[PDB]
Symmetry: C3
Subunit: 440 residues, 3 copies
């Protein structure tokens, strides 16, 4: 025992309100595990199992205890975004309509003016000592169900706004795991404050406004092997005030405002990811993000190919850069950048797009980065995945002049090696060490 199955718990009804059921199970664990030091233990925690099923959550789950594992048997993802943009008269012929797996349907109202925490299906919160530790979420689905009108006049299902969060961790935490999950149609998939030695590993986090956000501060954590797709006003991967973070082996696709965004992040590594955006400002190191390694990533920036998101932007223009750095002593090494754009969609009109921009800070080392830039003709089609795939396989283009590296006058004493020809590297040679990539 200490093993519970939500379909076998005698209180509540998991189809109607799985929140109530899980809170009831948590009360039972605490009632049984009252003593902290009996035969060298006494509070080992528990596992709560969700079989495949459609489970409505109407009461927020409060997780107050260490070593709690909540697990299911399916990440359950299907593209609600595609389905909600299929003409409605065709829905009866679709084999299915909704995500599945071990599915928690989040039916909470939007969070108040206090916060988003109130809109989270699972809230992890505990103050005092020690930090809550080794909570595990595994292999289930959290589904926000619908997005809602936002004043823009866009389809309500394409706004990425509903005030719902999948998992929200409010308190300092240690050794947490989020693995094998599916998150869909949430304004925020996963928000974790004050994380130590966290692992976010092998999840599918897509069609959420903002996917992964590490807030407050943190250390010694990792975000690995995820498939991630956000919305144009949110983050794919975000961290602030982290040290020693490792972000690797993620496949991040559209349509977040950015792929990776750091504020005040130090001594971290963003390496070996595949990153694909429809907008500039893919990787942002801001507010003294320093001594970070950004290595061997594949960056692709192109244009949205799917008609229902034509015109949808993140507000940033082509001078922003694909990689933007404000901070000291970073290392940008061995990245590939593909810039695949339509010259007459470049903004501002007639600008030369920038790839890497150093806006502030000193001592950045940028070496052995390959920039390929291409001028294609933009187009939109109605069939989502066909258009996406055709777009990736298309190479049928003219050449395009770009600025591979732009060092603003506010950044100096950088070293730029083999990351562009002299024309491609716009920088003051008197206060930065520049070696042009050899040419013919």
């Amino acid at each position: 025992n200490n093993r519970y199955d939500v379909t076998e718990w005698p209180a509540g009804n998991p189809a109607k309100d799985i929140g109530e059921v899980i809170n009831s199970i948590i009360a039972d664990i605490k009632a049984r595990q009252g003593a902290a030091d009996v035969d060298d233990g006494g509070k080992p925690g528990a596992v709560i199992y969700l079989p495949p099923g459609d489970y409505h959550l109407r009461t927020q789950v409060l997780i107050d205890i260490s070593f709690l594992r909540i697990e299911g048997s399916g990440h359950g993802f299907t593209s609600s975004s595609i389905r909600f943009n299929v003409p409605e008269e065709e829905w009866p012929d679709l084999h299915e309509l909704w995500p599945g797996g071990s599915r928690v349907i989040v039916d909470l109202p939007a969070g108040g003016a206090g916060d988003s925490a109130a809109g989270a299906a699972f809230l992890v919160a505990r103050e005092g000592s020690p930090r809550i530790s080794s909570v595990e979420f595994s292999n289930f689905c959290i589904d926000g169900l619908h997005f809602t009108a936002d004043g823009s006049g866009r389809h309500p299902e394409n706004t990425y706004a509903n005030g719902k969060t999948g998992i929200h961790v409010a308190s300092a935490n240690d050794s947490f795991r989020v693995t094998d999950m599916g998150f869909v149609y949430l304004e925020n998939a996963l928000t974790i404050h004050k994380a130590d030695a966290l692992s976010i590993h092998h999840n599918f986090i897509a069609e959420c406004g903002s996917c992964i956000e590490l807030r407050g501060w943190g250390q010694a954590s990792k975000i690995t092997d995820n498939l991630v797709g956000a919305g144009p006003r949110g983050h794919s991967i975000y961290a602030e005030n982290h040290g020693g973070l490792l972000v690797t082996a993620n496949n991040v696709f559209p349509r977040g405002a950015s792929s990776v965004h750091f504020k005040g992040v130090t001594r971290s590594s963003v390496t070996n990811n595949r990153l694909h955006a429809f907008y500039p400002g893919m990787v942002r190191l801001e507010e003294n993000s320093s001594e970070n390694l950004v290595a061997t990533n594949h960056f692709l920036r192109d244009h949205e190919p799917w008609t229902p998101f034509f015109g949808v932007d993140n507000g940033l223009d082509d001078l922003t850069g694909l990689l933007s750095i404000s901070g000291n002593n970073n290392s940008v090494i061995g990245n590939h950048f593909s810039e695949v754009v339509d010259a007459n969609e470049i903004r501002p009109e007639g600008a030369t797009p920038v790839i890497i921009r150093l806006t502030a800070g000193t001592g950045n080392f940028v070496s052995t980065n390959h920039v390929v830039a291409m001028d294609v003709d933009a187009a939109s089609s109605d069939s989502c995945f066909e258009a996406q795939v055709d777009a990736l396989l298309a190479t049928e283009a003219a050449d395009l002049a770009v600025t591979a590296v732009l060092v603003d006058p506010g950044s100096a004493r950088n070293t730029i090696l083999d990351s562009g020809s002299d024309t491609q590297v716009v920088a003051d040679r008197a206060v930065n060490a520049i070696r042009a990539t050899p040419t013919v």
Copy 2:
């Protein structure tokens, strides 16, 4: 419920034909999940559990539904290749003879002249909309049992031919997972057509003719953390017409024809793998494979040390290259190449082996690759793992001249930096930018 255990299903017998049992379970799921939009769901799918056991499959499983998870409790791998080459009179003294775990023994005949799909233990197929989604295969064993005579006069168990496939996905699919599996003694372990956002993660796929094949087209997928060993007429990792594929953190060992093979693959990353082959042509980018990052891989090419495969080749000679590129605007950065061969086994007689070959395309960037080449004396021994390990630890060699980079006249406007001395880099300096690695 929606949870099934194949040993607790009242129809069929999983020891005799687990195929029939699983198909029966799938019919039950469909019978119960008929309605697509009842209380915001209705087709959440299911989980089918295989306890550890030896289960014969005589009827192909047809997977027709989204959010189906099939799981077990052991990848169950043992080297049938070693065992089948042990003298038969010694078999009674072996502690065990066969793979184990949650084991599906594939007893289907070879596929007809239509196709290999008919020889697959699990076939995933569904047409219409939407694409089948979020099917999961986890932590079980698929065993082809024996290889069969192929006309070559080789031992029938060493042919890698039986017409059997582990898992075959014929239809466009989204968010699929194959994790923690074991595949053994199959002509094809895993063949997945038309994949979107697929994850093939942390499997053991070995002693199969061909291991992973991604066919038709695809996008935004990943192949990570696998242990992979194929056969000399097949692929280790293969993809065609994929965009945005990430292949990382795999340990690929002998004896596939290649370690990674791309046809028409674009905007992808093959980075941070350990790759070991007994033959040339380890990593092949062919048929306009363009804008790919190939970074920080460890390549080892040497000679087969195990006597029962002496003389077995993939048909390619030492001029082929360890890495061969036909395509535009790729990035080859920070790889290590160990070429450990016996000079008198080099073919054609008296050739200088090539390491990286650019056969066609423009704009490839090749930078900071270390090539170490060595002339050793070839040998074969009868004890498989002892010989393999001794061979890897052996450094007792003379020096060997190699061509680090060969740029054919059909490839031009490439950039080659610090990837060999001038002698080691055979290329037209007038139409490629070449910087020799500094020497003494």
Copy 3:
């Protein structure tokens, strides 16, 4: 069946001695699986499940059979190190005191003068043929409970000494997996001899004297996605006489003697890890460790910030190097090194710290490594995680002269490119090819 739950086994008591229970289950599996070739199988193995719980182990588990899986439902980690250094009168106010999850408490005496194997909770041993294969340990907790006085006069809980091992594999093995575990308060977490195609993946291995040790020899293995923290007389990741090892995507934090230590390791890759130490000698390639790739790692060396470990060293001084190489033909490419030290704590007094040191061997290629060095004021605070995090986020420092690369006269014919200025690279230019990083 072949599925067992230790709380449902009729012999012994898993709370008192889970060792006896598991050994009893193993005898039952062998009694049932006597025949090796009945209908193409007969020894498929088994799965043993540990629900969340506190389980004392007083008898060593002997694992003698292939395809055994032992699994739980929680890695269960909490910092016993922090708790044992909290004043004792405050313990009654802590929410909990001990690790949890599916918890095996190791209550064996320390191993005799024969060996440490006798102190292991789980011993995997079998001689003869074939090698034991595809044993899996997953998602449970192994807890050494306490460290003991060691003659140093340190707190007994801070010695990292108790003679206990989590899992010890004594025999040649194939296709083993250790995944999702938690190890805490063990002198040795995981020791695996003679490993072939092993995967140590996604574990939490911390506050153990020595974490991962691969001994004897091995091949084609991988250590990926682990969180790892050892003690100052032990190893974080250690291997000897391995070929084809891949160590990637690990986040290794203090306070092991080293982060990665190789003896006699060849043709391997240590790439894309985040490594953090409080002492020199972070990555050691020793005793002819040759043809290894060390690429795109983030190294941080700084000072211990937590008062109860002030003064605790690994015995090595600042001339040792962060990366030390004794071996031929290695490749050191694209690493970031942050050296964050207090100039008056540098030892010996007045030394210039070294970052990469080549002590012996020929043909090493060192290219495009960024070294950032800083002089800060050392300090200690009592609040562990606050001090750790503040320390990582602190950049408030003066500049510090370092030797980026030191090539001893005993190492020659190396190539050093863009890994330091001429002053920073101390090497005989007549017998090594040196290119200084361009400067202003």
